[PDB]
Amino acid sequence: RAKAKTRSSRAGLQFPVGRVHRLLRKGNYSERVGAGAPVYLAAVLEYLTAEILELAGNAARDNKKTRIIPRHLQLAIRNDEELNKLLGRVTIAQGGVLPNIQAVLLPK
Amino acid sequence: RAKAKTRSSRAGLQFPVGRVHRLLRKGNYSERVGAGAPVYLAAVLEYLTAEILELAGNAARDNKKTRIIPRHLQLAIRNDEELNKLLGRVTIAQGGVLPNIQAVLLPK
Amino acid sequence: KVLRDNIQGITKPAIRRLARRGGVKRISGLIYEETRGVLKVFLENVIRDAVTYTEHAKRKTVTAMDVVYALKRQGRTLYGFGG
Amino acid sequence: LRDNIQGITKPAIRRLARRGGVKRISGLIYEETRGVLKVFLENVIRDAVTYTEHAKRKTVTAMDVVYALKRQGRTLYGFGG
Amino acid sequence: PHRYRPGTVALREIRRYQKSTELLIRKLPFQRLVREIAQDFKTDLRFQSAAIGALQEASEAYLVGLFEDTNLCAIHAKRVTIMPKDIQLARRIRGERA
Amino acid sequence: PHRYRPGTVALREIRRYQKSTELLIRKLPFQRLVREIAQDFKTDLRFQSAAIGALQEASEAYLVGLFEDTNLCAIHAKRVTIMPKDIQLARRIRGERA
Amino acid sequence: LIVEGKREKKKVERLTMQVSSLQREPFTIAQGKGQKLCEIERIHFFLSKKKTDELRNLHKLLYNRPGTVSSLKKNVGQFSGFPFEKGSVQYKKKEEMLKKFRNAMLKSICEVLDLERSGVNSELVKRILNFLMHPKPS
Amino acid sequence: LIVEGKREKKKVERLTMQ
Amino acid sequence: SRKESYSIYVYKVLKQVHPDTGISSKAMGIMNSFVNDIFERIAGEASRLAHYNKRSTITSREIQTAVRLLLPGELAKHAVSEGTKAVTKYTSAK
Amino acid sequence: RSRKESYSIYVYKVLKQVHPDTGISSKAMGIMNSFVNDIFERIAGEASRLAHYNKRSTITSREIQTAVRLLLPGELAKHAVSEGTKAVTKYTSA
DNA sequence: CCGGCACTGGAATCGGATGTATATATCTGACACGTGCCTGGAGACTAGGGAGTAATCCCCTTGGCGGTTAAAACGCGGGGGACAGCGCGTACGTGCGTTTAAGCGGTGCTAGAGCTGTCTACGACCAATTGAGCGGCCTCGGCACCGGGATTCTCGATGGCA
DNA sequence: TGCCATCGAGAATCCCGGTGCCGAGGCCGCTCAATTGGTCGTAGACAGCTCTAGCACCGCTTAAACGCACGTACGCGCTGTCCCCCGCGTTTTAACCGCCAAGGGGATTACTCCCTAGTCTCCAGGCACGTGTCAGATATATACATCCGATTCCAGTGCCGG
């Protein structure tokens, strides 16, 4: 037998192709699942995760911090237009709100 | 071989139990379907249909007509609280709106 | 053949009739342009989704089921066109 | 347990309004806020108890709350699932 | 030398159009608008008649609902005339705009 | 005796509470309220601590969003004070009330 | 189907309501072709001795605005006549406002302006209106 | 789980602005 | 080339509630849309319920719980009554 | 006493790729796990509906691509489609 | 200091114009029924595993108890904002005459949707390995306090100059 | 007579050095889930045909859209008043925290046996086609219900004399 090589390394990915395949096969989505559907899905999920993590890390750096906390994720999501569209009806625990005071309320 | 009788007649129903069972088995909802699930579902569907039809027939009679049109269904649904909640995000084609004018706009 | 400037085909009397069905008595003169913009955005969203549905099926014709699926996907269920 | 809606005090509602950006508050706002919160909690707790009863359990878990909120279009992150 | 005062014909029009169910937009202009919007996503597209009918029905329902919300926002501010700011407020609270 | 004008401290609190992330309602009264509401649906119920934590986070998020909408409705009517009418209008347009 | 480069990052636009606007001074000049009622010593003396209600009625006649009690004496003293001529739409609109005043109030306005308190309503109107075009030291 | 008679139909209340 | 719908059953129900009343074709199309919509709602809720509890079968218990989750109060009570009565009759006089 | 599965190690690998000197706490990791599960369910459900509409038994990468185009906003959808296409091409060539 | 006596303004009382509901007469096309047939549901079996039930164990939820201590409740001034009234000016509503294109009936022409048949590559399934990820444990540094200055920021009290 | 810029007082809000701890980040062993290799049957891709329906052009009538004018009522600004909400100091009140204890119930195996999937017949419920007649749409003729301008008509001012 030749030595194993996971499908993730074959596709050049970090997310697991085999686990995504198993979830698709046991999720009651269809009768059959093609070979390339898990690869596509894993690549898309990895891309979205990297997009959020970049902004969250920048937000943490702006506050002179080393580790990301839920507040940094909330700031990153709510300051980005498309991420705000995708996660419009989502609540993040311990995230807080964006600072915003209406102009009519500030002292004259 | 004895003479066939539909499951609907056994359940005392008008809606088709066999067709509901077939739709349940081919919709990718679960792996197996129990014997009493289609009977229960057909009974619920029949009850809801009868409720709406009973209201719409009263609306049609109040408009002095012997046939039901989409306007009668819209009036029945929008004048009933439970139905209005159930079908809150639904549009009925050629149904119109409920007559309602605010009091401030009316003449003194 | 290319189409252009059809948004003006939604005339001011039509917008007035639509506002009358909504119970409005007085309308300022700047409403018609704003209404035209709102309608254009709504139609762009729905038509984009419906054409995606049409292209997946490998068809050249948009059907009523495509529009029904697009509207249901956007949270606006319509009864009376086959779904 | 009786009359526990008064435990939501006026200073707590004022803090919640300040996080929302409100500068001035009328005196009749606190009873209205209490009623709104009561209705919201009744809906969510009813759905969560239905989920608990289907599983033949006697304890409400955080997963039941998450499922109820997702049912009401109020998805919440950071509590499992 | 016979004239109605402002608001009388408007109230008549409200009662007339809150009782009927027909479409209030001309079909040919709406079809032209739909085809022009669609020609950006894909070229040489055909449409069924029922597809344009469904689009028009949905569009009219959407606009009528928005106008009712706009009227509520205008009456809240002690007016009887609707303005673009009322539309923007209604669309922001509905969640269709940040 | 030093004193601040009405509005200075309110703006200070807005800035202070729009920067933190902690919960603003006390835990014990909220827990008692949750158990009291649940008593109607079923008797002798038990709760995990994480379930009450999830309920509290959801409740505070919901109320803060509603207060934001209410403040918009109040400013639309040329006021700075929020009233129950603003809450009613916001809930009506959101769709939580016919 | 493969894009190049990063992704364009747009910013969220939040709805804000108009804060509206305020101006410190309502009128830039409002100065007429005559002497100020404060420089005419005798009118300044009568203006110093008259009640707040005569001054309210005179400020309503001059500036069409209710005057604040402190400003009221300053605002009437700084009046230098009207900038419009006999027969203007403004002249007719002041003449009607004078015809609509009670005879006792016209007699009080004549006494503020050193005008004679004698004669018919229409003459008190004419004498005040000529004086409010060209306030002359008597 | 079985019950008697018809259901209690209710009226929808609409927000009105003073 | 044969297309199925719910028209005949809706007509039977109408003839039961209103013996001397008819219906138009457009109203019947709206009724078919309503029936399909409610069917998908209940079936999807029951499918998620079965998945949450690690079950392979959808039974009448799942249907009852989904009906209680989706319908408003009195509607849900009377629907539960009708479904229970139908199942009892079916299992009763087999 | 039975093993639980999550995405923590893969999320940590992606973070080490984008920010080599940044860490993450447990609460933020739980939020990221919830996000991954949410997006997976959304895309899988849309692909299931797409296959049902066109009367097909299998879900392929065409269904995943169409679902991604239907769910994501514009630039995100374009770059996700590019990423998926690149991954599938690399997998097939190898 | 009258005082009639014209004058005027309002109020309530018509009364024409117009819009709209109501009472018959036709008329047509859509609905409700009847018929044939075909395929999808019923009936009768068999086989295998999904779930119900019975124990069993240990975590975790519910009470109970003191002790600080910060948050909450309660008066108390006082100032700023909500609300009502008034005036002006312009921008929408109503109505009329002139333009325009929507809707309708008709006729072709062809693109493509839908169906049928034919293969074949691809996904399900099974069996034997093996290393990737998970649970458990240890360790040290990022972050939370804690304090000492330090730099701005309201608010009113004052001084100097004209 | 003020005014104004005066502050500077005092309060809040950063900025930086020092200490401690518990939570995140590496190791380690194991087992189970993913990987490899090989069959097999069917789902889907491709290649024709058949018509249906979607597009395109053409007159024609007529209702709707479009400018245009005028006047009224509504939006918006300004002023004044008062009462309600904010800021602050003092006294209660109970939330929070750190322990201790006991039992309920959730969470995991083991057995078994009903309950559902999978095959063949087979026959009758439901769908497609075809037709007649009656419910509703249309057309007039007529009476009733509002709208709004007008006229009349109670009492209370300006003219002019007195």
Nearest nucleotide by C1' from D9 CA?
Answer: K72
CA distance E59 to chain G (A): 24
Question: For chain E, what is the radius of gyration of the CA atoms?
Answer: 18
CA distance A91 to D77: 6
Its sign, for the CA torsion B49, B54, B59, B60, is: positive
Q: What is the DSSP string of E18-83?
A: TT--S--S-HHHHHHHHHHHHTTT-SS-EE-HHHHHHHHHHHHHHHHHHHHHHHHHHHHTT-SEE-
- Per domain, the residue ranges of chain J are 25-93
Rounded CA-CA distance F83/D26 in Å is 6
Two tokens, residue J2:
């039975």
Residues 11-50 in G contacting F (C-alpha not used; CB under 8 Å): 15, 17
Quote the CA–CA distance of I40 and I35 in Å, as a whole number: 9
Q: What is the 3-state secondary structure (H, E, C) of C18-52?
A: HHHHCCCCEECCCHHHHHHHHHHHHHHHHHHHHHH
Q: Do J35 and A77 touch, CB atoms closer than 8 A?
A: no
What does the alpha-carbon distance between residue A99 and residue F93 come to, in Å, rounded to a whole number? 25
Q: Give CA–CA dist J67/G101, Å, rounded.
A: 80
F36 CB burial (10 A radius; 0-12, 13-18, 19+): middle
CA–CA dist J52, J47 (Å, integer): 9
Q: What phi and psi values does residue G24 have, to the nearest 5 degrees?
A: -65, -45
| Domain I22-92 belongs in CATH node 1.10.10.60 | no
Closest CA to C19 of B97, H18, B72, B76: B97
Query: Per the CB < 8 Å rule, is H10 touching B84?
Result: no
Q: How far apart are CA A9 and CA F41, in angstroms?
A: 53
A70-78 helix and J26-53 helix, angle to the nearest 10 degrees: 50
Helix (H) or strand (E) holding I40, with range, is helix I25-52
Give the tokens for residue D52. Answer: 């608990």
CB B99 within 8 A of CB E18: yes
Residue type for A32, please?
A: R
Cβ-based neighbours of J63, under 8 Å, separated by 6 or more: A37, J47, J50, J51
Q: E with F: how many residue pairs have Cβ under 8 Å apart?
A: 31
Nearest Cα to Cα of residue E63 among F98, I26, C10 = C10
Extract the tokens encoding D59.
Answer: 């304890």
Q: Which residue has the tokens 């069905």?
A: C21
What is the distance between the alpha carbons of residues A36 and A39, in angstroms, rounded to a whole number?
5
B28's torsion region: left (phi>0), alpha (psi -120 to 50) or beta? left
Residue C79, C-beta contacts closer than 8 angstroms, at least 6 positions apart: B90, B91, B92, B93, I29, I30, I33, I34, I37
- CB neighbours (10 Å) of residue G25? 5
Structure tokens at A47: 């891309």
End-to-end CA distance of chain C: 33
Residue with tokens 């989750």: I69
Exposure on the CB side of residue F16, measured as CA atoms within 13 A: 11
Alpha carbon distances (Å) from D34 to D10, D39, F30, J32: 10, 9, 12, 33
Instruction: From E58, B18, B25, select the one nearest I47 (Cα to Cα).
Output: B25
Number of neighbouring beta carbons within 10 Å of residue I58: 25
- Looking at the complex, report in whole angstroms how far the Cα of residue B58 sits from the nearest Cα belonging to chain E: 18
Chain centroid to Cα G81, Å, comes to 11
Cβ contact C82:C65 at 8 Å: yes
Joined tokens for residue J92: 């097939």
Q: Which two tokens stand for residue G105?
A: 């109030």
Contact F58, A91 (CB under 8 A): yes
- H/E element, C63: none
Beta bridge partners of F46: D59
CA C60 to each of CA C52, E47, F46, J64, J70: distance values in angstroms, whole numbers, following the listed order = 11, 9, 59, 21, 19
Contact (Cβ atoms closer than 8 angstroms) between residue J70 and residue C74: no
Name residues whose C-beta falls within 8 Å of residue J37's C-beta, 6 or more positions apart in sequence: D81
| Contact criterion met (CB below 8 Å) for J39 and A48 | yes
| Integer Cα distance of D66 and D64 in angstroms | 5
| Structure tokens given for G100 | 């609509």
Which of E 75-94 have CB under 7 A of nucleic chain L?
Answer: 79-81, 83
The answer to whether the CB atoms of D21 and A91 lie below 8 A apart is no
Among protein residues, the one whose C-alpha sits closest to the C1' atom of L23 is J25
Measured in angstroms, what separates residue J68's CA from nucleotide L41's C1'? Answer: 32
Q: Retrieve residue B104's tokens.
A: 């401030």
Determine contact, residues E54/C67, Cβ cutoff 8 Å.
yes
CA distance D50 to chain I (A): 7
Strand A90-92 and strand F46-47: the pairing is unpaired
Distance in angstroms (rounded) separating the CA atoms of residues G103 and G118: 11
Q: What are the chain D neighbours of J37 within 8 Å (beta carbons)?
A: 81
Q: How far is E80 from chain H (nearest CA, A)?
A: 12
Which nucleotide comes closest to E85 if you measure CA to C1'?
L75
What distance in Å separates the CA atoms of residue I36 and residue F13, rounded to the nearest whole number? Answer: 53
Chains that touch J (3 or more CB pairs under 8 A): A, B, C, D, G
CA distance G86 to B87: 72
Range of the domain at B21: 7-86
Residue A70 CB neighbours (<10 A): 21
Residue C13 identity: P
Phi, psi for residue C27 in degrees, rounded to 5: -130, 130
In the structure, how far is the CA atom of residue F6 from the C1' atom of nucleotide L86, in angstroms? Answer: 5
Distance F66 CA to K135 C1' (A): 44
* Angle between the N-to-C axes of helices A37-62 and A17-26, in degrees from 0 to 180, rounded to the nearest 10: 120
H helix or E strand, kind and range, residue I57 = strand I57-58
What Å value separates CA F2 and C1' K146? 28
For chains E and J, tell me whether 3 or more CB atom pairs sit within 8 A of each other. no
What pairs with residue C78 in β-bridges?
A: B91
Nucleotides on chain K that have an atom closer than 7 A to a protein CB are 17-20, 30-32, 39-44, 50-51, 60-62, 71-73, 78-83, 87-88, 91-95, 101-103, 111-115, 122-124, 129-135, 142-143, 154-156
User: Taking the CA of residue G4 as centre, how many other CA atoms within 13 Å lie in the half-sphere pointing to its CB?
Assistant: 0
**A91 reaches D (C-beta below 8 A):** yes
User: Residue G20, CB half-sphere, CA atoms under 13 Å: how many?
Assistant: 8
d(CA C25, CA E82): 9
Contact (Cβ atoms closer than 8 angstroms) between residue F96 and residue H10: no
Radius of gyration of chain I (CA): 16
Specify if A1 maps to a domain. no
Strand ranges (E), chain D: 24-25, 59-60, 75-77
Residue G71: exposure state from Cβ atoms within 10 A (0-12, 13-18, ≥19): exposed
Sequential DSSP letters for G97-118: HHHTS-HHHHHHHHHHTT----
What sections of chain J are H helices per DSSP?
Answer: 8-18, 26-53, 61-71, 74-93
Distance (Å, rounded) from C-alpha J38 to C-alpha D77?
A: 9
From the Cβ of A2, is strand L under 7 Å away? yes
- For F45, the closest of D2, D58, D66 (CB atoms) is D58
Are J53 and A30 in contact by the 8 Å Cβ rule? The answer is: no
* Number of structural domains in chain F: 1
User: Is the domain defined by J25-93 classed in CATH 1.10.10.10?
Assistant: no
* A1 sits within 7 Å of strand L by its CB: yes
CB neighbour burial string for G79-98, b if at least 16 within 10 angstroms, e if fewer = bbbbeeeeeeeebeebeeeb
Token digits of residue J14: 């992606």
Burial class (CB in 10 A: 0-12, 13-18, 19+), D31: exposed
Say yes or no for a CB contact (<8 Å) between B95 and E80.
no
Give the three-state DSSP class for F81.
strand
Residue A103 lies in a domain: no
Distance CA F54, CA F42 (A): 20
**What is the least distance, in Å, from the CA of I35 to any CA of chain C?**
10
Residues 6+ apart with CB under 8 A from F91: D36, F66, F97
**CB within 8 A of G110, min separation 6: which ones?**
G116, G117, G124, G127, G128
Touching pair E, C by Cβ (3+ pairs < 8 Å): yes
Q: Is A88 exposed, middle or buried (0-12, 13-18, 19+ CB in 10 A)?
A: exposed
G60: number of Cβ within 10 Å = 14
Q: What is the token pair recorded at G103?
A: 């005879």
Rg, chain H, Cα only = 15
Distance J3 CA to L32 C1' (A): 10
Query: Which DSSP category does G37 fall into?
Result: T
DSSP secondary-structure letter at C80?
Answer: S
Dihedral angle of Cα B65, B66, B69, B75, to the nearest 10 degrees? 60
* Residue of J53, A23, F81, I41 lying closest to C53 (CA atoms): J53
CA C62 – CA C65 distance, rounded (Å)? 8
Residue G66 has what DSSP assignment? P
Q: Is F98 on the interface with E (CB under 8 A)?
A: no
Cα–Cα separations (whole angstroms), residue F40 to A56, D2, D48, F36, G133: 43, 12, 13, 8, 83
Any idea what the CATH number is for the domain that residue F96 is in?
1.10.20.10
Residue with tokens 């091409």: J89
Nucleotide K58 C1' to residue J53 CA (A): 51
Resolution in A for the shown PDB structure? 2.7
Which position has the token pair 């919901």? Answer: F62
F34 and F59 Cβ atoms separated by less than 8 Å: no
Q: Which amino acid is at E51?
A: A
Assigned token pair, J30: 């739980």
Handedness of CA A7, A11, A16, A20 (dihedral sign): negative
Contact present, J28 and A70 (Cβ < 8 Å)? yes
Residues G82 and G132: beta-carbon distance below 8 Å: yes
Interface contact B31-A28, CB threshold 8 A:
yes
Å from C3 (CA) to K112 (C1')?
24
Amino acid identity, position A29: Y
What residues make up the domain containing E92? 1-98
B84/F95 touch (CB, cutoff 8 Å), yes or no: no
I5 touches strand L (CB under 7 A): yes
Structure tokens at I66: 């989904």
Kindly report the nearest CA distance between residue J37 and chain D, in angstroms: 7
Cα pseudo-dihedral A48, A53, A55, A61, rounded to 10: -170
Give, for I1, the enclosing helix (H) or strand (E).
Answer: none
Number of domains forming the structure of chain B? 1
Q: What are phi and psi of G80, to 5 degrees?
A: -110, 25
D74 neighbors F63 (Cβ within 8 angstroms): no
Instruction: Please count the other Cβ atoms lying within 10 Å of the Cβ belonging to residue D4.
Output: 16
Pairing label, strands A32-33, C26-27: unpaired
Q: Is C60 helix (H, G, I), strand (E, B) or coil?
A: coil
Q: Beta partners for A91?
A: D76
Tell me, yes or no, if B100 comes closer than 8 A to chain C by beta carbon: yes
Name residue, tokens 């005879």. G103
* Separation between the CA of I81 and the C1’ of K57 (whole angstroms): 41
Cβ–Cβ < 8 Å for D63, A79: no
What is the secondary structure of B54-85 as a DSSP string? HHHHHHHHHTT-SEE-HHHHHHHHHT-HHHHH
Contact check, Cβ <8 Å, J30/D81: no
H helices of chain G, in order, are 41-49, 52-63, 69-77, 89-99, 103-112, 121-133
Report the residue count for chain G: 138
- Strand L atom within 7 Å of B106 CB: no
What's the Cα-to-Cα distance from C69 to each of C50, E93, F71, rounded to whole Å? 7, 26, 37
Residue of E5, E21, E71, E76 to mutate, testing the B interface (most B Cβ within 10 Å of its Cβ): E21
The reply to whether A104 falls in a domain is no
Q: Is A38 exposed, middle or buried (0-12, 13-18, 19+ CB in 10 A)?
A: buried
CATH number at A58 reads: 1.10.20.10
Compute the distance between CA of residue G6 and CA of residue E41 in angstroms, rounded to an integer.
Answer: 23
The sign of the torsion formed by the CA atoms of G61, G67, G69, G72 equals negative
Considering all nucleic acid strands, name the nucleotide whose C1' atom is nearest to the C-alpha of residue I57. K50
Q: Check if the beta carbon of residue E7 is closer than 8 Å to that of residue C10.
A: no
Residue G135 Ramachandran class (φ > 0 left, ψ -120 to 50 alpha, else beta): beta
Residue pair C21/E64 in contact (Cβ under 8 Å)? The answer is yes
Dihedral sign, CA of B62, B66, B68, B71?
negative
Residue whose token pair is 């400037």: C5
Show the domains of chain D with their CATH numbers.
Answer: 1-79 (1.10.20.10)
Q: Where are the beta strands (DSSP E) in B1-108?
A: 32-33, 67-68, 90-92
Chain D residues within 8 A of A89 when measuring between CB atoms: 73-75
